[PDB]
Design a protein around this nucleic acid. Sequence first.
RNA 1: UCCAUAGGUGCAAGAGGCGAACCAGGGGAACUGAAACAUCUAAGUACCCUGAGGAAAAGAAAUCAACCGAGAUUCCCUUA
RNA 2: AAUGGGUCAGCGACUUAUAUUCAGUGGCAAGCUUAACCGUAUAGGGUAGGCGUAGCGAAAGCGAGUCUUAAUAGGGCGUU
RNA 3: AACCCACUCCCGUUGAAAAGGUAGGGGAUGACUUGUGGAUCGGAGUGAAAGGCUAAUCAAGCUCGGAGAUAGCUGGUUCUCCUCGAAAGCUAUUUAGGUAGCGCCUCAUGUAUCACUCUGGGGGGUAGAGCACUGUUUCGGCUAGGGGGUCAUCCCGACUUACCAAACCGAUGCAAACUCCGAAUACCCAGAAGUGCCGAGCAUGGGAGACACACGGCGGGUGCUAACGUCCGUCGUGAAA
RNA 4: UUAAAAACACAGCACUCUGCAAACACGAAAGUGGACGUAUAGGGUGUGACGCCUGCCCGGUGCCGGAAGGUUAAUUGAUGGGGUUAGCGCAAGCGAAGCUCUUGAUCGAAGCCCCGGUAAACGGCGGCCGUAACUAUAACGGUCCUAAGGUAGCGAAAUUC
RNA 5: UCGCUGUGAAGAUGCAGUGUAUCCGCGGCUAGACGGAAAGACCCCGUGAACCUUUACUGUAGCUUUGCACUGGACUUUGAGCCUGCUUGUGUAGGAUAGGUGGGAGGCUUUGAAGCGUGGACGCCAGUUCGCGUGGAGCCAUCCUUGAAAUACCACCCUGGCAUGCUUGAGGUUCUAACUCUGGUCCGUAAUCCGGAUCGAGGACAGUGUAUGGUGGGCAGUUUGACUGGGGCGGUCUCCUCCUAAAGAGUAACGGAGGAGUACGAAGGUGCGCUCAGACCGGUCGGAAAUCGGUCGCAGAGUAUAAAGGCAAAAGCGCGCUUGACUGCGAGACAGACACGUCGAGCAGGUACGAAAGUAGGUCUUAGUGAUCCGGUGGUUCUGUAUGGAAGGGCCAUCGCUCAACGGAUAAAAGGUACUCCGGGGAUAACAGGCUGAUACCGCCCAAGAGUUCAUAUCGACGGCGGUGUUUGGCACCUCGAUGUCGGCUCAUCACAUCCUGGGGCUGAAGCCGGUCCCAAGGGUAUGGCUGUUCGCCAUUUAAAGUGGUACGCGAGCUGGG
RNA 6: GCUUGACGAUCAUAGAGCGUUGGAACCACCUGAUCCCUUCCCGAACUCAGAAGUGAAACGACGCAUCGCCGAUGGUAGUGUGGGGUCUCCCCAUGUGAGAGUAGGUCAUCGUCAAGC
Length: 51
Amino acid sequence: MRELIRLVSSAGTGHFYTTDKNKRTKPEKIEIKKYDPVVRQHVIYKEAKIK
RNA sequence: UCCAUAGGUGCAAGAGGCGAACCAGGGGAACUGAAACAUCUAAGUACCCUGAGGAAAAGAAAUCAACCGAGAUUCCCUUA
RNA sequence: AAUGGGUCAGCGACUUAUAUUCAGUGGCAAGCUUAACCGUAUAGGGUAGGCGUAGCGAAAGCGAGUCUUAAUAGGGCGUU
RNA sequence: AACCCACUCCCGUUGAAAAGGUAGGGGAUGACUUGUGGAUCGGAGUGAAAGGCUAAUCAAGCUCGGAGAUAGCUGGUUCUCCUCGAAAGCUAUUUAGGUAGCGCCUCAUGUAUCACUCUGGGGGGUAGAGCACUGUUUCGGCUAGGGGGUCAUCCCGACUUACCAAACCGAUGCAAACUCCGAAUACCCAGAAGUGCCGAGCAUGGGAGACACACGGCGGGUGCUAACGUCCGUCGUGAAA
RNA sequence: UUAAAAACACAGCACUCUGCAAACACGAAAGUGGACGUAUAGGGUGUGACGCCUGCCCGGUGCCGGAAGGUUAAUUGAUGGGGUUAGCGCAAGCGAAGCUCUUGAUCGAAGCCCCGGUAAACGGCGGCCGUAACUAUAACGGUCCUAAGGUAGCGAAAUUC
RNA sequence: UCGCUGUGAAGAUGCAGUGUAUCCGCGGCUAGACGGAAAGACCCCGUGAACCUUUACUGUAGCUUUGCACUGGACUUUGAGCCUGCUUGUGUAGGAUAGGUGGGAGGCUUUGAAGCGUGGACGCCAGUUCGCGUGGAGCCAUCCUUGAAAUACCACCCUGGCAUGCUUGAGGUUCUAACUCUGGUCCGUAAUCCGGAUCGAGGACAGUGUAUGGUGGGCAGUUUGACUGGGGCGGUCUCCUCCUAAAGAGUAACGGAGGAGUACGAAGGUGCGCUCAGACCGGUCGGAAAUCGGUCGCAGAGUAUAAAGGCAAAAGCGCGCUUGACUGCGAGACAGACACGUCGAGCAGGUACGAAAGUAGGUCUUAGUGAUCCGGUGGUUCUGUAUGGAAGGGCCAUCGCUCAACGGAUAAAAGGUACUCCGGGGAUAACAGGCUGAUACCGCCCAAGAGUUCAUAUCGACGGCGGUGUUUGGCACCUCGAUGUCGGCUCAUCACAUCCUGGGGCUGAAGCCGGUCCCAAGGGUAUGGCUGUUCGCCAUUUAAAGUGGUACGCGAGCUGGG
RNA sequence: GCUUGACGAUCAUAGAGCGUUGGAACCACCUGAUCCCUUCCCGAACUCAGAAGUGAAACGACGCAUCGCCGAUGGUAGUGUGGGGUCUCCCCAUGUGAGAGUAGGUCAUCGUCAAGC
Ligand SMILES: [Mg+2]
Ligand SMILES: [Mg+2]
Ligand SMILES: [Mg+2]
Ligand SMILES: [Mg+2]
Ligand SMILES: [Mg+2]
Ligand SMILES: [Mg+2]
Ligand SMILES: [Mg+2]
Ligand SMILES: [Mg+2]
Ligand SMILES: [Mg+2]
Ligand SMILES: [Mg+2]
Ligand SMILES: [Mg+2]
Ligand SMILES: [Mg+2]
Ligand SMILES: [Mg+2]
Ligand SMILES: [Mg+2]
Ligand SMILES: [Mg+2]
Ligand SMILES: [Mg+2]
Ligand SMILES: [Mg+2]
Ligand SMILES: [Mg+2]
Ligand SMILES: [Mg+2]
Ligand SMILES: [Mg+2]
Ligand SMILES: [Mg+2]
Ligand SMILES: [Mg+2]
Ligand SMILES: [Mg+2]
Ligand SMILES: [Mg+2]
Ligand SMILES: [Mg+2]
Ligand SMILES: [Mg+2]
Ligand SMILES: [Mg+2]
Ligand SMILES: [Mg+2]
Ligand SMILES: [Mg+2]
Ligand SMILES: [Mg+2]
Ligand SMILES: [Mg+2]
Ligand SMILES: [Mg+2]
Ligand SMILES: [Mg+2]
Ligand SMILES: [Mg+2]
Ligand SMILES: [Mg+2]
Ligand SMILES: [Mg+2]
Ligand SMILES: [Mg+2]
Ligand SMILES: [Mg+2]
Ligand SMILES: [Mg+2]
Ligand SMILES: [Mg+2]
Ligand SMILES: [Mg+2]
Ligand SMILES: [Mg+2]
Ligand SMILES: [Mg+2]
Ligand SMILES: [Mg+2]
Ligand SMILES: [Mg+2]
Ligand SMILES: [Mg+2]
Ligand SMILES: [Mg+2]
Ligand SMILES: [Mg+2]
Ligand SMILES: [Mg+2]
Ligand SMILES: [Mg+2]
Ligand SMILES: [Mg+2]
Ligand SMILES: [Mg+2]
Ligand SMILES: [Mg+2]
Ligand SMILES: [Mg+2]
Ligand SMILES: [Mg+2]
Ligand SMILES: [Mg+2]
Ligand SMILES: [Mg+2]
Ligand SMILES: [Mg+2]
Ligand SMILES: [Mg+2]
Ligand SMILES: [Mg+2]
Ligand SMILES: [Mg+2]
Ligand SMILES: [Mg+2]
Ligand SMILES: [Mg+2]
Ligand SMILES: [Mg+2]
Ligand SMILES: [Mg+2]
Ligand SMILES: [Mg+2]
Ligand SMILES: [Mg+2]
Ligand SMILES: [Mg+2]
Ligand SMILES: [Mg+2]
Ligand SMILES: [Mg+2]
Ligand SMILES: [Mg+2]
Ligand SMILES: [Mg+2]
Ligand SMILES: [Mg+2]
Ligand SMILES: [Mg+2]
Ligand SMILES: [Mg+2]
Ligand SMILES: [Mg+2]
Ligand SMILES: [Mg+2]
Ligand SMILES: [Mg+2]
Ligand SMILES: [Mg+2]
Ligand SMILES: [Mg+2]
Ligand SMILES: [Mg+2]
Ligand SMILES: [Mg+2]
Ligand SMILES: [Mg+2]
Ligand SMILES: [Mg+2]
Ligand SMILES: [Mg+2]
Ligand SMILES: [Mg+2]
Ligand SMILES: [Mg+2]
Ligand SMILES: [Mg+2]
Ligand SMILES: [Mg+2]
Ligand SMILES: [Mg+2]
Ligand SMILES: [Mg+2]
Ligand SMILES: [Mg+2]
Ligand SMILES: [Mg+2]
Ligand SMILES: [Mg+2]
Ligand SMILES: [Mg+2]
Ligand SMILES: [Mg+2]
Ligand SMILES: [Mg+2]
Ligand SMILES: [Mg+2]
Ligand SMILES: [Mg+2]
Ligand SMILES: [Mg+2]
Ligand SMILES: [Mg+2]
Ligand SMILES: [Mg+2]
Ligand SMILES: [Mg+2]
Ligand SMILES: [Mg+2]
Ligand SMILES: [Mg+2]
Ligand SMILES: [Mg+2]
Ligand SMILES: [Mg+2]
Ligand SMILES: [Mg+2]
Ligand SMILES: [Mg+2]
Ligand SMILES: [Mg+2]
Ligand SMILES: [Mg+2]
Ligand SMILES: [Mg+2]
Ligand SMILES: [Mg+2]
Ligand SMILES: [Mg+2]
Ligand SMILES: [Mg+2]
Ligand SMILES: [Mg+2]
Ligand SMILES: [Mg+2]
Ligand SMILES: [Mg+2]
Ligand SMILES: [Mg+2]
Ligand SMILES: [Mg+2]
Ligand SMILES: [Mg+2]
Ligand SMILES: [Mg+2]
Ligand SMILES: [Mg+2]
Ligand SMILES: [Mg+2]
Ligand SMILES: [Mg+2]
Ligand SMILES: [Mg+2]
Ligand SMILES: [Mg+2]
Ligand SMILES: [Mg+2]
Ligand SMILES: [Mg+2]
Ligand SMILES: [Mg+2]
Ligand SMILES: [Mg+2]
Ligand SMILES: [Mg+2]
Ligand SMILES: [Mg+2]
Ligand SMILES: [Mg+2]
Ligand SMILES: [Mg+2]
Ligand SMILES: [Mg+2]
Ligand SMILES: [Mg+2]
Ligand SMILES: [Mg+2]
Ligand SMILES: [Mg+2]
Ligand SMILES: [Mg+2]
Ligand SMILES: [Mg+2]
Ligand SMILES: [Mg+2]
Ligand SMILES: [Mg+2]
Ligand SMILES: [Mg+2]
Ligand SMILES: [Mg+2]
Ligand SMILES: [Mg+2]
Ligand SMILES: [Mg+2]
Ligand SMILES: [Mg+2]
Ligand SMILES: [Mg+2]
Ligand SMILES: [Mg+2]
Ligand SMILES: [Mg+2]
Ligand SMILES: [Mg+2]
Ligand SMILES: [Mg+2]
Ligand SMILES: [Mg+2]
Ligand SMILES: [Mg+2]
Ligand SMILES: [Mg+2]
Ligand SMILES: [Mg+2]
Ligand SMILES: [Mg+2]
Ligand SMILES: [Mg+2]
Ligand SMILES: [Mg+2]
Ligand SMILES: [Mg+2]
Ligand SMILES: [Mg+2]
Ligand SMILES: [Mg+2]
Ligand SMILES: [Mg+2]
Ligand SMILES: [Mg+2]
Ligand SMILES: [Mg+2]
Ligand SMILES: [Mg+2]
Ligand SMILES: [Mg+2]
Ligand SMILES: [Mg+2]
Ligand SMILES: [Mg+2]
Ligand SMILES: [Mg+2]
Ligand SMILES: [Mg+2]
Ligand SMILES: [Mg+2]
Ligand SMILES: [Mg+2]
Ligand SMILES: [Mg+2]
Ligand SMILES: [Mg+2]
Ligand SMILES: [Mg+2]
Ligand SMILES: [Mg+2]
Ligand SMILES: [Mg+2]
Ligand SMILES: [Mg+2]
Ligand SMILES: [Mg+2]
Ligand SMILES: [Mg+2]
Ligand SMILES: [Mg+2]
Ligand SMILES: [Mg+2]
Ligand SMILES: [Mg+2]
Ligand SMILES: [Mg+2]
Ligand SMILES: [Mg+2]
Ligand SMILES: [Mg+2]
Ligand SMILES: [Mg+2]
Ligand SMILES: [Mg+2]
Ligand SMILES: [Mg+2]
Ligand SMILES: [Mg+2]
Ligand SMILES: [Mg+2]
Ligand SMILES: [Mg+2]
Ligand SMILES: [Mg+2]
Ligand SMILES: [Mg+2]
Ligand SMILES: [Mg+2]
Ligand SMILES: [Mg+2]
Ligand SMILES: [Mg+2]
Ligand SMILES: [Mg+2]
Ligand SMILES: [Mg+2]
Ligand SMILES: [Mg+2]
Ligand SMILES: [Mg+2]
Ligand SMILES: [Mg+2]
Ligand SMILES: [Mg+2]
Ligand SMILES: [Mg+2]
Ligand SMILES: [Mg+2]
Ligand SMILES: [Mg+2]
Ligand SMILES: [Mg+2]
Ligand SMILES: [Mg+2]
């Protein structure tokens, strides 16, 4: 079943998004551009551990 | 058991028992509430026991405050 | 053909204390009111305290504003 | 026999008696019966064991205290007149005979809306109807084809379809979970006349009760279109006339 | 004080515990019974004169013995990570010694896991296929499972619908 | 203070209609007053109670393990630490030997006694250390070659292992002086208690305090859901779709049918482009069904996942680019007890596609879910108990429940009661009454057929229509502050759907006997064996051994076998 | 008013099917694939440069009711209110009133703009 993950900003802020994924099917990480509220720009977010 | 100790007799002085409550201690429930019930509550209450007094207890900061200060203990009204 | 009462006389069930809210009726009025306690004792004193005159925010705080927010934009609450 | 016991019948049952009597019955030198004095007791004693007995009380004695334990459960609640007037529903609940918010009653304050009819706008998929879809029914015609055989062809060509037959054409029925169609009524909305007991609507506060409903008509499920059956919707009456 | 019996006891039988300050029981304890007894004794448990007998299963749950290994308490405190501040630094920030907050290496018995016994310990003791000179039935063969598949006796029974 | 028949909270002295009847005792009998007595004991309910059980939960007495204390000496085995000489340092490599660093570049202390080696050895073994066997004797040649740095030389630490030292974990043995003795003899003393003394035995064990693991129904406080055509057993309990549902919304049943407790980094956004299923004809192995060509067809396909409502600007299909599955909000609504829920134009920041107008705050829509408390993680213009910090708290983001009994009592919980008890209920079962009549029983309609032929003498298949309250049931209206339930005895009373006796028609009625139907209720209508039996089966009778109602008549009339 | 193109209004009385007809202009077919651009292959489609040919295909216009689609009048079914019966179903008074079918209609009717008369 899908497991929760965190998406941490590449900037120095501590902002993060949250979602889930299928680890068995797609085993690589996710690199997706999102808006960072603290710096008010679109930056790249990287997968991390929910726990 | 040598010493002297336990022990044994004689004198004096005191205590012992009773009392409704109050006071300082020792021991210490459950029903009940939680709309069930174990933590919790009821409650350190009921009850039992021991001492004292006309009262008792506590009392003269190894205390509080907050950089300004207060000045032993007890009781009342607020802070609440 | 469900309950209660053989009858009479007497007795027998919404109380009291303390904290409060609303209404009626009064005293003062941007102020109102004292508690313990003194007392010439139902008087008078005692205004420590309580409520009101300003709100918003979790708070620091700022204030007819304030909070949220990058935002004197929008919106919540408040102000004649 | 005495003495200890208690198997049977009857009487008695407001008794002579809160366990007896008459007539029969068992043991009767023993694990016997009995007097006096003594010991063990309340989660404790004693018991050749029946949960028996512990002062006519025992699956935990009596007495006084905690104590007016607690009781969503029964019962009861005392003088008079006037105005108004319910509910037995929805939601949640270790909830279902309790309670809480909302709906329904009453009182106060404020404020401007309401009801009935006429006219004008609006959506619908019910009753009915139908077969255009999805299922289901019958008749006839027309047929691919399976094949009923077929001269029996070593086994392949066929003579024909004497059985069955998709599909198509026409006729003809049915449907809560079918629809090419489709009302009445009921619901929203607006504009108007009058009536309203002088108000109807709405908002905010004080006080509730109630959340076991019953039958009758109409529309339904369930049942046997059985029940003074039962479970909904909508009216009327009883409740409370 | 509605049940006198098939219920309880019983003599006999068996298992098990106990070496004496006994096991065991009543007692916060002192002590007392057991017992002024001593394994031919004392306690508990079941069965219930006598006769003939008392079959199979140690997988479960108890009890008994074993000690190699695994897991394992309080206790102890290696290691790592923080807080404070003499100092250094323009600053940001680094920071010795003390004190202090967490972390948790190592040490550690019984028990449990393991190995083996024990049923007059608590308990348990099966199915399906073929097969005989008529039929029928299977002495006989396969096969599944189990710790093992009920023996001797008795049986429409105080048990049988 | 009458009977009957109806009615009626459904079994009436009291109501309706009607019939009977002067007023009042005494002796008797018990059919009724749902007669008296005991707030039903059966049954259900109460977030009632007792007592009992156990591998329910949570604990506990007792028993047992180990640490510390009371609690000491010696010897020995042994792990760890520590001190000293540290002599040990044998690799590719070098005559020979590598852990390195500074003084140091040759050693001249009996030279550095010399070639092998003697006594002892170790040795990645043939190398090195220790008196040259004689004795006061020229060997290591200092990069002499090689080796990553040549020894000689003063110092800085350890390494394979030894000796001792002061400590230290465990093990065994012993000693006596702590402790213990429910062992002897002396004294207090006139004493099987108790002390003190002294002998004997055990002995740092036992035992007790405190801390800790195990065991522990021996004992204790409790828990063990609700709905429900009575309870129990079974089933269900949250969410989505359709019907019921009566053409706005909503609407119940243990009513009729199905699904959910997910999926997807593309299955999302955008630009561009394109249409299906199926049928027929033609065409290599396939042949009804592969891929190819053509015509028809238009949605009979598809849509991640049930069903319903939708789908041409396709919401279906493919390709390029991509992250709007964005952050702060939010006019206004829909739903609604609350807590929750649903839709959304527009504004501000930053984006993505597209030439651009523009589109994008996930997916065609409606299921895919769980409050608060508590604890964890990342930030932070907050707070931080004298002060500066810090701990802890607040705010923002996020994680942990099949709390499925799904608004979730607690972090933590099963049973028995026939030994039972209290408060209640005809709000709710068992007996009898009531309503109903599926079923039961009794009639009738049709007539295939059986009856040698012949439908109806006697029967009668497949089907149909009634009657009675009479069986098994359905319901739950009366009674739980009590209406005694099977069978037997005693005593009855009524109906007729007649068993005998009486009167008739038909007959497949010769007679004697019968069969069937019609009329008729006056009177009659067995005894026994077995069983608690009513029934039933047997034996022997009789003219015959009727069927039913009456609280399945009758316990204030008896019994007590069930 | 006449013909052809673009965009609309309206969504079958406007559609389908059959027959006839249109190249002056427009439109369509057409030639080639150098150049922009394109095919998961192909200039088939998209695109570019015009122009020799034709109205065949397509499209438009005009005819026909064969199919489709519209469709009365009258009657019938249902139904709100009030009242009756023999009451599982109906009837009466009053208001309302389908679906199906029958007679019959239909080969559409309009607006803006630009090219030729
Ligand atoms: Mg003396
Ligand atoms: Mg005194
Ligand atoms: Mg006194
Ligand atoms: Mg005290
Ligand atoms: Mg005291
Ligand atoms: Mg105390
Ligand atoms: Mg309690
Ligand atoms: Mg309670
Ligand atoms: Mg309570
Ligand atoms: Mg309770
Ligand atoms: Mg509790
Ligand atoms: Mg507990
Ligand atoms: Mg307490
Ligand atoms: Mg006290
Ligand atoms: Mg005194
Ligand atoms: Mg004094
Ligand atoms: Mg005194
Ligand atoms: Mg005095
Ligand atoms: Mg004084
Ligand atoms: Mg004093
Ligand atoms: Mg003093
Ligand atoms: Mg000072
Ligand atoms: Mg002083
Ligand atoms: Mg009466
Ligand atoms: Mg009664
Ligand atoms: Mg009465
Ligand atoms: Mg009652
Ligand atoms: Mg009475
Ligand atoms: Mg009085
Ligand atoms: Mg007032
Ligand atoms: Mg005033
Ligand atoms: Mg504002
Ligand atoms: Mg405002
Ligand atoms: Mg006796
Ligand atoms: Mg006699
Ligand atoms: Mg006698
Ligand atoms: Mg005797
Ligand atoms: Mg004798
Ligand atoms: Mg004797
Ligand atoms: Mg005897
Ligand atoms: Mg005697
Ligand atoms: Mg005595
Ligand atoms: Mg006594
Ligand atoms: Mg007791
Ligand atoms: Mg006892
Ligand atoms: Mg007993
Ligand atoms: Mg007893
Ligand atoms: Mg018993
Ligand atoms: Mg007494
Ligand atoms: Mg007694
Ligand atoms: Mg008790
Ligand atoms: Mg109390
Ligand atoms: Mg009381
Ligand atoms: Mg009660
Ligand atoms: Mg209740
Ligand atoms: Mg009552
Ligand atoms: Mg009462
Ligand atoms: Mg009125
Ligand atoms: Mg209720
Ligand atoms: Mg009630
Ligand atoms: Mg309520
Ligand atoms: Mg219909
Ligand atoms: Mg029809
Ligand atoms: Mg059809
Ligand atoms: Mg329909
Ligand atoms: Mg309607
Ligand atoms: Mg008036
Ligand atoms: Mg009100
Ligand atoms: Mg209700
Ligand atoms: Mg009521
Ligand atoms: Mg109702
Ligand atoms: Mg009801
Ligand atoms: Mg009703
Ligand atoms: Mg009805
Ligand atoms: Mg009904
Ligand atoms: Mg009915
Ligand atoms: Mg009813
Ligand atoms: Mg009704
Ligand atoms: Mg009414
Ligand atoms: Mg009336
Ligand atoms: Mg009336
Ligand atoms: Mg009422
Ligand atoms: Mg009336
Ligand atoms: Mg009324
Ligand atoms: Mg007896
Ligand atoms: Mg006897
Ligand atoms: Mg007896
Ligand atoms: Mg007995
Ligand atoms: Mg003993
Ligand atoms: Mg023995
Ligand atoms: Mg014994
Ligand atoms: Mg026995
Ligand atoms: Mg026996
Ligand atoms: Mg016996
Ligand atoms: Mg026996
Ligand atoms: Mg075993
Ligand atoms: Mg074994
Ligand atoms: Mg062992
Ligand atoms: Mg610091
Ligand atoms: Mg620092
Ligand atoms: Mg430090
Ligand atoms: Mg260890
Ligand atoms: Mg061990
Ligand atoms: Mg054995
Ligand atoms: Mg046995
Ligand atoms: Mg045998
Ligand atoms: Mg037998
Ligand atoms: Mg048996
Ligand atoms: Mg009568
Ligand atoms: Mg009557
Ligand atoms: Mg009468
Ligand atoms: Mg009367
Ligand atoms: Mg009358
Ligand atoms: Mg009357
Ligand atoms: Mg008389
Ligand atoms: Mg009599
Ligand atoms: Mg009588
Ligand atoms: Mg009676
Ligand atoms: Mg009675
Ligand atoms: Mg009572
Ligand atoms: Mg009762
Ligand atoms: Mg409960
Ligand atoms: Mg309850
Ligand atoms: Mg118990
Ligand atoms: Mg337990
Ligand atoms: Mg313990
Ligand atoms: Mg210890
Ligand atoms: Mg002893
Ligand atoms: Mg020891
Ligand atoms: Mg020990
Ligand atoms: Mg201990
Ligand atoms: Mg127990
Ligand atoms: Mg117990
Ligand atoms: Mg217990
Ligand atoms: Mg309790
Ligand atoms: Mg309980
Ligand atoms: Mg519970
Ligand atoms: Mg229940
Ligand atoms: Mg049931
Ligand atoms: Mg019901
Ligand atoms: Mg029922
Ligand atoms: Mg029901
Ligand atoms: Mg019922
Ligand atoms: Mg509706
Ligand atoms: Mg409706
Ligand atoms: Mg609805
Ligand atoms: Mg309802
Ligand atoms: Mg999609
Ligand atoms: Mg669909
Ligand atoms: Mg794409
Ligand atoms: Mg995205
Ligand atoms: Mg938007
Ligand atoms: Mg934007
Ligand atoms: Mg762009
Ligand atoms: Mg909690
Ligand atoms: Mg501080
Ligand atoms: Mg912090
Ligand atoms: Mg629940
Ligand atoms: Mg719930
Ligand atoms: Mg719910
Ligand atoms: Mg809900
Ligand atoms: Mg609770
Ligand atoms: Mg219980
Ligand atoms: Mg009772
Ligand atoms: Mg009661
Ligand atoms: Mg009832
Ligand atoms: Mg009920
Ligand atoms: Mg019955
Ligand atoms: Mg009866
Ligand atoms: Mg009955
Ligand atoms: Mg009945
Ligand atoms: Mg009944
Ligand atoms: Mg015949
Ligand atoms: Mg005949
Ligand atoms: Mg009857
Ligand atoms: Mg009946
Ligand atoms: Mg009933
Ligand atoms: Mg009921
Ligand atoms: Mg009912
Ligand atoms: Mg009755
Ligand atoms: Mg009853
Ligand atoms: Mg009564
Ligand atoms: Mg009669
Ligand atoms: Mg007759
Ligand atoms: Mg007869
Ligand atoms: Mg005859
Ligand atoms: Mg007959
Ligand atoms: Mg007769
Ligand atoms: Mg007769
Ligand atoms: Mg007669
Ligand atoms: Mg007669
Ligand atoms: Mg006569
Ligand atoms: Mg007889
Ligand atoms: Mg018999
Ligand atoms: Mg005869
Ligand atoms: Mg009779
Ligand atoms: Mg009877
Ligand atoms: Mg009878
Ligand atoms: Mg009797
Ligand atoms: Mg009887
Ligand atoms: Mg009697
Ligand atoms: Mg009677
Ligand atoms: Mg009677
Ligand atoms: Mg009698
Ligand atoms: Mg009996
Ligand atoms: Mg018409
Ligand atoms: Mg009507
Ligand atoms: Mg009409
Ligand atoms: Mg028409
Ligand atoms: Mg039509």
